[PDB]
């Protein structure tokens, strides 16, 4: 499974001007998902990692998914 | 949770020239994930749905994630 640095998750979430709660709602994983991901205590779903990588490069795509 | 038609999943997977096995590896969900999704017998992760919607519009983004 592709892995991801917790710091990368924080970076992209903040670039998108999302709260942890909002990110968890949009990307899935349950209410406290991003809180755990950003502490390195859970692994996001592979699709969450890949979607975050896409959004890091093309943040305007948030308007297509939110 | 946003829902998705099984036919949409098939459409995007085939547009991307992926097998069910390849899609399951790239997007996650386990080996038989797409087999189940395309029969309507499991719900993809929210990030999988959103990433498929992005790829339907911008299929070239497969090169950023594969």
Swiss-Prot record, chains A, B:
Induction: Induced by amino acid starvation, glucose starvation and when translation is blocked. Induction is decreased in the absence of the Lon protease suggesting, by homology to other toxin-antitoxin systems, that Lon may degrade the MqsA antitoxin. Transcription is activated by MqsA. It has been suggested that MqsA represses its own operon. Not more induced in persister cells. A member of the mqsRA operon. This operon induced by ectopic expression of toxins RelE, HicA and YafQ but not by MazF or HicA. Its cofactor is Zn(2+). Degraded in the presence of oxidative stress, maybe by the Lon and/or ClpX proteases. Keywords: DNA-binding, Metal-binding, Repressor, Stress response, Toxin-antitoxin system, Transcription, Transcription regulation, Zinc. One of its GO terms (biological process) is regulation of DNA-templated transcription. GO terms for cellular component: toxin-antitoxin complex. GO terms for molecular function: metal ion binding; protein homodimerization activity; sequence-specific DNA binding. Residues 20-39 bind DNA. Homodimer. Crystallizes as a heterotetramer with MqsA, MqsR-MqsA(2)-MqsR. Purifies as a probable heterohexamer of 2 MqsR dimers and 1 MqsA dimer. Binds promoter DNA as a dimer. When the 2 dissociate the MsqR mRNA interferase becomes active. Antitoxin component of a type II toxin-antitoxin (TA) system. Labile antitoxin that binds to the MqsR mRNA interferase toxin and neutralizes its endoribonuclease activity. Overexpression prevents MqsR-mediated cessation of cell growth and inhibition of cell proliferation. Initially reported to act as a cotranscription factor with MqsA. Following further experiments, the MqsR-MqsA complex does not bind DNA and all reported data are actually due to a small fraction of free MqsA alone binding DNA. This is Antitoxin MqsA. It comes from Escherichia coli (strain K12).
């Amino acid at each position: 499974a592709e892995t991801v640095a917790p710091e990368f998750i924080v970076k992209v979430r903040k670039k998108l001007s999302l709260t942890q709660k909002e990110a968890s709602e949009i990307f899935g994983g349950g209410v406290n998902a991003f809180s755990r991901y950003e502490k390195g205590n859970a692994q996001p779903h592979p699709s969450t990692i890949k979607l975050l990588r896409v959004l890091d490069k093309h943040p305007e795509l948030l308007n297509e998914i939110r």
